[PDB]
């Protein structure tokens, strides 16, 4: 029933995205010819496979994929949020309101970050990038083709963060203080993702995702133990501080040192617009500045984290 079911959608927000996803998947899978052609393939799978190899190119079908899994992640956020977290988040209870609002949001945070972190370390594991060995982020720069897992992870992150920005600017309900800085974070995350996928700097973009995810996983664990306070809170937070220092500041700073020393002398370094070799002396400032952006934001976050540590130490 048209608006009776609009109401039931008001009772279950995820239902319309689930309806769209199930319709598209059903059309693609009942068609039989689950091939590289048709249309729904370009919508629901990574396209531009180079021959019959594990190497995928770039194109407009990437935009189609990102759009479709924006729809998917919009379904997943709402469905997981209510049906899993709220019964869990009041199944033991945290009687407040904003308390429960932050519990459910941070539980979703830990869920997607716990999914996206280890997958990132997996995709970094079986590749020459192991343990941030920058010498590998430039040794073959133009990198027109990515492996399957690599491309899927990269476009999944793109879709997820684009959907986060879409939820943000489309004010359904306006949350507290953290709003605008959070918008800045999503904007710079999308600038990283897009400008590194488009300009082929994707290997050098993988470790930054890994650091950001693992730091956010530990941060979310500690914050949810804070809003669900217990003895474990302090220990988890101290481990978060250690890992934040190491991963974010040390790894991103050594990556910046790398951009300097092994950008100038670790492969092709003569600009050639014909072969789309953009690693040059004109791109080094852009790379350094646009990673120093994240570095300064991390410094600010660290300052306030320090402040928090001091105050909780003297309380």
């Amino acid at each position: 029933i048209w608006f009776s079911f609009r109401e039931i959608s008001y009772r279950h927000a995820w239902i319309a995205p689930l309806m769209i996803l199930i319709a598209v998947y059903s059309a693609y899978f009942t068609s039989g010819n689950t091939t590289k052609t048709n249309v729904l393939h370009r919508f629901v799978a990574v396209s531009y496979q180079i021959g019959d190899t594990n190497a995928y190119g770039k194109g407009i079908n990437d935009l189609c994929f990102v759009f479709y899994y924006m729809i998917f992640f919009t379904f997943l956020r709402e469905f997981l949020m209510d049906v899993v977290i709220r019964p869990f988040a009041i199944r033991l209870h945290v009687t407040s309101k904003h308390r429960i609002k932050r519990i459910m949001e941070q539980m979703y945070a830990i869920f997607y970050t716990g999914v996206s972190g280890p997958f990132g370390i997996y995709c970094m594991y079986h590749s020459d990038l192991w343990f941030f060995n920058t010498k590998a982020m430039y040794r073959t720069y133009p990198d027109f083709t990515n492996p399957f897992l690599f491309k899927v992870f990269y476009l999944g992150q793109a879709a997820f963060w684009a959907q986060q920005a879409c939820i943000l600017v489309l004010q359904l309900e306006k949350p507290r203080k953290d709003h605008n800085e959070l918008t800045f974070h999503h904007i710079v995350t999308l600038l990283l993702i897009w400008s590194s996928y488009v300009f082929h700097f994707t290997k050098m973009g993988l470790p930054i995702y890994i650091t950001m995810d693992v730091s956010d996983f530990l941060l979310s664990f500690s914050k949810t133990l804070n809003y669900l306070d217990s003895g474990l809170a302090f220990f988890s937070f101290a481990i978060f501080v250690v890992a934040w220092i190491y991963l974010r500041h040390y790894i991103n700073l050594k990556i910046l040192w790398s951009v300097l020393t092994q950008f100038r002398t670790e492969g092709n370094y003569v600009l050639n617009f014909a072969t789309q070799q953009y690693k040059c002396w004109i791109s080094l400032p852009i790379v350094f500045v646009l990673i120093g952006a994240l570095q300064l934001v991390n410094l600010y976050w660290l300052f306030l984290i320090f402040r928090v540590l001091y105050r909780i130490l003297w309380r």
């Binding site: 935009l63 920005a165 879409c166 600017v169 489309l170 004010q171 359904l172 999308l190 897009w194 400008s195 488009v198 003569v270 600009l271 050639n272 617009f273 014909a274 789309q276």
Partner: protein, 133 residues
Amino acid sequence: PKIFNLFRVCFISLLLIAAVEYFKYGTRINYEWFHCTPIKEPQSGSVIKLWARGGPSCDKRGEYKTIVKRITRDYEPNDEHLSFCIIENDNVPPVHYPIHEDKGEPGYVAYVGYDTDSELVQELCADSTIYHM
């Protein structure tokens, strides 16, 4: 609940995506503009000599493209008919310019002119086939 703001930010983002996509494509199809600079040294009359001088990115294809562009863009064949020739340098691989300052003998060299002084172009282009326009 505001939707038009969402389309305002999505349209801007999508247009920027399409702008960078076209930037890459445009700088790739016509790259010799950035790398190669035409060097024209006039002979006696309306006849000049063309070549290109750039970095290692100015390969023989870039030299040929920039020479042809100069020939078909600096001379108007509706005023009077021109005639040119293009001479290849065979003792040279396709990528042949050092980065720094002494590029060497260019891969392609062309002589262009008009028909009021066609004999001269025939003289300079000793054996290379003369093209008319």
